[PDB]
Amino acid sequence: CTLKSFTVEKGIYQTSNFRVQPTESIVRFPNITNLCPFGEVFNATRFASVYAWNRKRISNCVADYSVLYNSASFSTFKCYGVSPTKLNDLCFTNVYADSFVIRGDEVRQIAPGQTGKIADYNYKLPDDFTGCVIAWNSNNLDSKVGGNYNYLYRLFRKSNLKPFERDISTEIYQAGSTPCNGVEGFNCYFPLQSYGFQPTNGVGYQPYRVVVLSFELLHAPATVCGPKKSTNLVKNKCVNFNFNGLTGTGVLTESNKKFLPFQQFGRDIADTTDAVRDPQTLEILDITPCSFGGVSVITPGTNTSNQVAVLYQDVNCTEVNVFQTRAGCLIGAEHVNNSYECDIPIGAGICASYQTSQSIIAYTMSL
Amino acid sequence: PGTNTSNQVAVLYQDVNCTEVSNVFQTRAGC
Amino acid sequence: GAENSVAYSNNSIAIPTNFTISVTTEILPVSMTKTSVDCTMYICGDSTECSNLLLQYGSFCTQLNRALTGIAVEQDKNTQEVFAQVKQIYKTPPIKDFGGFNFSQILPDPSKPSKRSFIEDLLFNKVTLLICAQKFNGLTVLPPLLTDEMIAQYTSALLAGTITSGWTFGAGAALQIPFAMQMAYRFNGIGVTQNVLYENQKLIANQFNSAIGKIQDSLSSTASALGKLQDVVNQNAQALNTLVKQLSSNFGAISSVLNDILSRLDPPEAEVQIDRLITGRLQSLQTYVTQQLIRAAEIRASANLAATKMSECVLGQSKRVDFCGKGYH
Amino acid sequence: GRLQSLQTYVTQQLIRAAEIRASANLAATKMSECVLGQSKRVDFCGKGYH
Amino acid sequence: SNLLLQYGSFCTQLNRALTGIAVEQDKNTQEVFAQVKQIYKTPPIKDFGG
Amino acid sequence: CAQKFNGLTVLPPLLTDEMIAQYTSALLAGTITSGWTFGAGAALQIPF
Amino acid sequence: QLPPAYTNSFTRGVYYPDKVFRSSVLHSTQDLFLPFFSNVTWFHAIHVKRFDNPVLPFNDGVYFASTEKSNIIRGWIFGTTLDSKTQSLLIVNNATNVVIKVCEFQFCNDPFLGESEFRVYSSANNCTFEYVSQPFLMNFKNLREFVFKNIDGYFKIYSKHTPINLVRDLPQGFSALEPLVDLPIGINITRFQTLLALHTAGAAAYYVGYLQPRTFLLKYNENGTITDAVDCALDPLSETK
């Protein structure tokens, strides 16, 4: 099926490769059960302006998004760089919940590389932001028929903002010439601007309580992790594993390197995870996977026989006659002690022929 | 000349008439 | 270098009176590490999404594997080529009545661990030499067909032939002849009548032995003129390292390990990032295999040159001046 | 684009270099064997007896 | 340049290959001409049988 | 000199042409004064 | 209180940039450091009210060659502009442990501790964190090579104490610098000043150097410690390496 031909001539040919199938999967976390405070800020009573938006840090707890699914009709819920269905299976790094309120009209003003007064002067996002946003109407919850003019939003500034920048210092803005001198001359408008948050207006002017979740990735075994259960520990078997988020496979064995109390991982000559410290027992292991080379097969040619000789290349094991060489585990060939001229080379001086009442034999070739 | 003996280096700018930035000897192959 | 005109006339002539045998080395790369790379393993790891996406460019994998296997068998053919001119394996007789000459560093030594002779072992040791770490991305290394044992045995056979039968074993069966007489034949080939040999045998023997000692030093010393083989191995290992290191690269995507993206993202929107990774690593494999082909062609040229040298210098006195050494050969 | 282009240039240069290397080895030979003494390899140092 | 930082190895890769070509060239000329070692000068006696 | 304008520098050779010419002059002088011996050790004057 | 004289470092200020253990890997990186042979501001208390910390610009990284033998130095303080209203950093190596507080500090004309003089905050209107740290109680032997890197909502402090043997500009030696504490604080800091424990004029000359982005070539030994490092911007030979 590989050579795309029925007849095959005497030679060595290389079929697909081979690896050991992994047997199990073990999950190891730190012993923590704290609850991530999210309701207190989402299901909150009062929010700050978009020029005075809150920046809160959250850490050392566990999160959930199913609760963020059944809760309510979140008018906007769309995530960036991450699928909203995977959070409870990943492991965050220093989430930050930031909130504010505008009209549902300008919800577009929240995007990477986004434009808008709120975006240019009041709340800037990164081009590379990771996370998402949650907003819902507050005209039905926090309502002022005349206009909830307690909520404000900056309308003027000289320079734009860096992503996630709050600036409060607000004198009477100067719109070019006719110097304002902070004395409100000509071209002097104030950056402070109020909204029209009224039940007496349409759905467009409905204030929408907005919140954003910014969080890093792959910088430390952060304590912001998911509800995954820790699991038992198995060793000397090709298994899956996750360690505080680091997800890989291989052979878990004890270490010999002297870590340091802060040292989390280990690495190698060429930047591969080769040693991990257990986030449960604080034990130090190393790793060696089992992607064990390719497979080839011998044949005397499909004009003389059918039997073959499979040859795996890297096995100090059984890993299902049989005869191990330096070139790997040879299967399906008797071994002898004579010597002849090489017919089908293998390597390390091993050749294979067909005459013995017939079979495949190998031998250290003669000269 | 090799770290094993000395630590003195002779830098060589590739192709410039000698006005870039002691004993600056001009070659056909650079300053 | 030095300058000296040559006093020339119409009736002046220089003529030599005394002479000096000499010995000089020559290195020649003759092979390189036959390797192989399992494409899907490298580009994709153990994903299947990555396998599906690679099914777009379908022919590239088999293509590259064919190329690299061609290189491998080419290497084995070279190594087979140089060290195969004798259908026999001669054994130097235990008698050491070699007209006074002392081949004791070049003839093999049974008491050694291998059958490597003195200078052979010295050399083999001088070029001192990470493996499994590399092997942990499918970048395996097929081993050579001929282990160094058989190589050394071939070499010893050749020595036995060229000192017992002189050269005739290169043209059929080996016909023994006393070594002094064979040396005399060698002289009579370069224009010096052979009587000079049977009149200077002792001096010549001493010169030869001292010369061999000279090489014993010039290698056992720190003066290592083995730059060639060393740099071959160097370029090979360095290309390997470049390839491997080009996995931390991001090629403009968000991550550099598939499992990362596949975990933190959904297929219909992560497949683009997977595509970018695919493109990048594919380009890397491509340039690597191209460099490999070129360097292998280089080594092939070098090996053919070595084969010609083996057939024309060893198996018989040459006459192409300054081709098998320096001065009359 | 520009990267691909530069790559192609490098590869072409390598191949030409290998060609020139072969030719130069041939040249060095013809020098050492043709100049520094006569060679009887017919039709290699020119045409006819050398 | 920041964007090029993604493909970071290509620059060194190429420059290395090209420098290899260059030093190979110089070695070519060396091998093709460094056979003599004593720079002889023609004698002033242009007497060569004719 | 037109190439030099995108970093496409051109390094110079190691041997200038004069050295090469002197080398060729050497070879000629040797050939016409010894003929092959100077290719095999010393240089031996010998009539043409 | 004599003027601070320029003196130069010598292979000082090499700290593990991260936690990733490696073994015999001659490995390059890029980060902020103290460039070699750099003129560090010798604050001479060997000059034979030198609480001489006029509120010193905390640039992005400050070497602090803590030179003390009997904890005559109390701690430090870190702020933005010291306007009596902003939220600052209090750093005292108290005799119970290292006590750290980020708080609504009210900078008086002398905001510091001692604890008798406490004109740091008259009121903790927003005292966002209190840090009763691990137990650490505080020639110049314990050259407490403290380095203050603050970035990314993280106030990071790498450190290592071990009795050195010299009473002048730092010795012609070399040693690593462990990481000690990163605190997820994230407040504005522009300038700082130390808290030398007030007896005071005293005599304990303590150096202060500045940091900035560079790139080094570390050398992890087989044990796994930084045995040597090389600047990549010092001398042509260094770039060769």
UniProtKB/Swiss-Prot annotation, chain A:
Positions of the BetaCoV S1-CTD domain: 34-227
Q: Where is this region: Immunodominant HLA epitope recognized by the CD8+?
A: 148-156
Q: What is the effect of changing residue 152 to R?
A: In strain: Delta/B.1.617.2, Epsilon/B.1.427/B.1.429, Kappa/B.1.617.1, Lambda/C.37, 19B/501Y, Omicron/BA.4, Omicron/BA.5, Omicron/BQ.1.1; Contributes to cellular immunity evasion and increases infectivity
Segments for region (Receptor-binding motif): 137-208
Changing residue 333 to V: what effect? Answer: In strain: 19B/501Y
Outcome, altering residue 205 to H: In strain: Omicron/BA.1, Omicron/BA.2, Omicron/BA.2.12.1, Omicron/BA.2.75, Omicron/BA.4, Omicron/BA.5, Omicron/BQ.1.1, Omicron/XBB.1.5, Omicron/EG.5.1
The record gives the effect of mutating residue 190 to S as: In strain: Lambda/C.37, Omicron/BQ.1.1, Omicron/XBB.1.5, Omicron/EG.5.1
Q: What is the effect of changing residue 219 to P?
A: Increased resistance to human covalescent sera neutralization
Q: Where does the UniProt entry place glycosylation sites?
A: 23, 25, 31, 43, 303, 316, 337, 356
**Disulfide bridges in this chain:** 36-61, 79-132, 91-225, 180-188, 238-290, 317-329, 342-351
Q: What is the effect of changing residue 160 to K?
A: In strain: Omicron/BA.2.75, Omicron/BQ.1.1, Omicron/XBB.1.5, Omicron/EG.5.1
The effect of residue 156 to L is:
In strain: Omicron/EG.5.1
Q: What is the effect of changing residue 184 to K?
A: In strain: Beta/B.1.351, Eta/B.1.525, Theta/P.3, Iota/B.1.526, B.1.1.318, Gamma/P.1, Zeta/P.2 and Mu/B.1.621; May enhance affinity to human ACE2 receptor
Effect of substituting residue 71 to L: In strain: Omicron/BA.1
Spans annotated as Receptor-binding domain (RBD): 19-241
Q: Tell me what happens on changing residue 335 to Y.
A: In strain: Gamma/P.1, 19B/501T, 19B/501Y, Omicron/BA.1, Omicron/BA.2, Omicron/BA.2.12.1, Omicron/BA.2.75, Omicron/BA.4, Omicron/BA.5, Omicron/BQ.1.1, Omicron/XBB.1.5, Omicron/EG.5.1
Q: What does the function comment of this entry state?
A: Attaches the virion to the cell membrane by interacting with host receptor, initiating the infection. The major receptor is host ACE2. When S2/S2' has been cleaved, binding to the receptor triggers direct fusion at the cell membrane. When S2/S2' has not been cleaved, binding to the receptor results in internalization of the virus by endocytosis using host TFRC and GRM2 and leading to fusion of the virion membrane with the host endosomal membrane. Alternatively, may use NRP1/NRP2 and integrin as entry receptors.
Q: What is this protein called?
A: Spike protein S1
Lineage start? Viruses, Riboviria, Orthornavirae, Pisuviricota, Pisoniviricetes
Q: Which gene encodes it?
A: S
Curated annotation (Swiss-Prot), chain F:
Q: What does this protein do?
A: Subunit of the fusion protein that is processed upon entry into the host cell. Mediates fusion of the virion and cellular membranes by functioning as a class I viral fusion protein. Contains a viral fusion peptide that is unmasked after S2 cleavage. This cleavage can occur at the cell membrane by host TMPRSS2 or during endocytosis by host CSTL. In either case, this triggers an extensive and irreversible conformational change that leads to fusion of the viral envelope with the cellular cytoplasmic membrane, releasing viral genomic RNA into the host cell cytoplasm.
Q: What is this protein called?
A: Spike protein S2'
Question: To which species is this protein native?
Answer: Severe acute respiratory syndrome coronavirus 2 (2019-nCoV)
The major lineage groups are: Viruses, Riboviria, Orthornavirae, Pisuviricota, Pisoniviricetes
